[PDB]
Amino acid sequence: VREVCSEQAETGPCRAMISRWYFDVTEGKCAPFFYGGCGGNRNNFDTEEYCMAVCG
Amino acid sequence: VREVCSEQAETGPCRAMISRWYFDVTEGKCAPFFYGGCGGNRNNFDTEEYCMAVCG
């Protein structure tokens, strides 16, 4: 909730290129990023609508 | 140090446009952002040197 929506997008150390969504506080909406497959944080949603459901 | 350095740059709810620096995890260095004068978070420095001291 709210709090997790403000961490920066974190690709993490793995090598996959998984399209995920994070809430962007500057833009005021969710934006895409490539997630590596491991590590990273809570501001990482499978789809844009999910990201918006939780953060938007 | 470290933990504060992963929050996004936050302008906050106040009305100013003040030049500040934040650590960007993707680029792995400090970058400029505009601060509104109140609120926001701790990833907010008056200089690049200071930002890099804490987060670099």
A45 in Cβ contact with A54 (< 8 Å):
yes
Separation of alpha carbons B35 and B10, rounded Å: 7
Nearest chain A alpha carbon to B28: A10
For chain A, the domain total comes to 1
Torsion of CA B5, A19, A31, B44, to 10 degrees: 10
Q: Which residues of B touch A7 (CB under 8 A)?
A: 6-8
Do A11 and B26 lie within an 8 Å CB cutoff?
yes
Please indicate the experimental technique that yielded this structure: X-ray
Helix ranges (H only) for B1-56 are 48-55
Q: Which residues of B touch A27 (CB under 8 A)?
A: none
Quote the domain boundaries for residue B45.
1-56
Q: Map residue A3 onto helix, strand or coil.
A: helix
The CATH number assigned to the domain holding A14 equals 4.10.410.10
Instruction: Kindly provide the resolution of this structure in angstroms, with one decimal.
Output: 1.5
